[PDB]
């Protein structure tokens, strides 16, 4: 095959295999995410909700930098761009169609980068002073994430999983199903959390 | 041309124009919506927030009946079905591609039928103080509606408004821009409402 993307009849000109190996991307992401998690842990310290703050920092980073990189630089598809573009080519080696610049993928991603990145960072920043809007922002960001991800799954399901090889453990099960299921489940828990707290605050008013 | 739908290269066999004229559909929906608004006003009696309740009842009605009708019967869309199917063909004469059964559109519509419809009825029920959840549900539903509508507009914009004639007063400006813009403007205002109240309720933390 000329390319690993599973709709193998795709004739992808301007396609260049990336010079940096995947372990480069893994090391870079692990290090940067560790730095963010540690720094946010310290800022929160100076119990679980501090972990949620670290989660929101990671989310803001992913939405703003990575997904923003996708929204800005499709369809470039040349590994001469940073390990962000190399990362996107690897994930597109996974199930989803991040090479074609699909209308929905670009639109959904632009919304999450422009809004949920900034709003997640606002969740963590304004959470450090226990501000009334905090549970509202946590709920809004988690609803937007759950909604975008549900549309993501629904669209690729009705498309018959055309994009990306089916059943594959790494590319389909870990990349497509698991991580996205994280953005389904974890903000779901956060939704339940924020709802319980906002309900308690609302019940007091009499 | 054999059909009025504007991607004029569309070769739509199995297309049958419905025998009922557009005034049939417009009168039917206008009357049923009047019935709903009046009955909901009476139920609220038994100021502005009562109008918001009537709005949410109308929203639940549209999401459940009309958009679920589309979600179930977006495949055949032959006017030999009730004035709902002809209603969808009439709207599809406008910009959007509700005849092709676009992969993205149905998915989005499914969500609004399955979630924002029932949740709107829960909003109107819970507003008579049956639960603190009334404002939370209002915020969740309005955020979801705004997200669906923004994705709708963005997706049709990147497509260059291919679907549906540009500039057309009735089909583009009234159907596509104006009506949908309601689900842009009104729930946005409603979000502000809940925020003002929810922030004040969260202000209770002392
Ligand atoms: C969050 C938005 N959702 C839809 C809502 C789209 C998915 O966003 C992806 C963003 C990149 C990233 C983290 C993904 C999982 C596996 C990672 C991949 C980055 C590159 C990695 C590190 C490798 O070299 C092997 C494992 C790969 C998730
Ligand atoms: C919020 C969801 N958004 C997508 C994000 C889709 C909006 O749902 C559509 C539901 C049918 C309806 C109301 C539409 C505009 C013009 C209406 C049309 C129905 C038939 C009408 C009444 C006529 O006979 C003349 C005016 C026509 C809006």
Residue numbers in the entry:
A (entry chain B), B (entry chain A): 7 to 52, 60 to 219
Paper text:
Here we present two structures of human EBP protein each in complex with a different pharmacologically active compound, revealing its mechanism of action in cholesterol biosynthesis and multidrug recognition. The structure was determined by selenium-based single-wavelength anomalous dispersion (SAD) and refined at 3.2 Å resolution with U18666A and 3.5 Å resolution with tamoxifen. EBP forms a homodimer in the crystal, as reported in previous solution studies, with dimensions of 65 × 30 × 55 Å.
However, when we supplemented the medium with either U18666A (an inhibitor of cholesterol biosynthesis and Niemann-Pick C1 protein)23,24 or tamoxifen, growth of the yeast was inhibited. Crystals were only obtained with U18666A or tamoxifen in space group P21212, owing to these two compounds presenting a high binding affinity to EBP. In the density map, the ligand (U18666A or tamoxifen) was determined unambiguously. We also showed that U18666A and tamoxifen bind to EBP in the same manner, implying the binding mode of EBP ligands.
